[PDB]
Amino acid sequence: ETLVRPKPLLLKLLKSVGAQKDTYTMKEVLFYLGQYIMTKRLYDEKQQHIVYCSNDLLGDLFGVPSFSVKEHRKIYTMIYRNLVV
Amino acid sequence: ETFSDLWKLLPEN
Numbered sequence: 869e870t871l872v873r874p875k876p877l878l879l880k881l882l883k884s885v886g887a888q889k890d891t892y893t894m895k896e897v898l899f900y901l902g903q904y905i906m907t908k909r910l911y912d913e914k915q916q917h918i919v920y921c922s923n924d925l926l927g928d929l930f931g932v933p934s935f936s937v938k939e940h941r942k943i944y945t946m947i948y949r950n951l952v953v
Numbered sequence: 954e955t956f957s958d959l960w961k962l963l964p965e966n
Contacts, residue, residue, distance in 0.1 A: 869966050870966045893966075894964075894965055894966045895965050895966070898960075898963055898965060902956075902957070902960045902961075905956065905960070906956060906957065911956040916954055916955050916956040916959060917954065917956070917959050919956075937956070937959045937960050937963070938959060940962070940963055940964060943963055944963065944964050
């Protein structure tokens with residue numbers, strides 16, 4: 869499908885959740901990236917679409933304190949800035 | 954609306 873290669877920070881985030889590799893389809897990236905968030909309970913408990921990452925590598929990565937998963941163009945863009953291919 | 958529901962609606966490619 870869309871085979872991407874994650875940048876250094878993102879690859880580290882990925883390994884953190886078991887993804888042991890250098891090349892991924894867009895789907896694997898999102899899957900693990902979602903597993904990281906769910907696992908480290910980084911979402912707001914009441915408004916689950918709010919994710920907090922100020923205190924997190926995810927924030928270093930996306931370069932923002934928090935974000936709304938409901939803003940597809942934003943999420944997709946931030947994620948793309950960290951990929952190649 | 955839970956996180957997992959929301960997150961799966963992201964562009965998969």
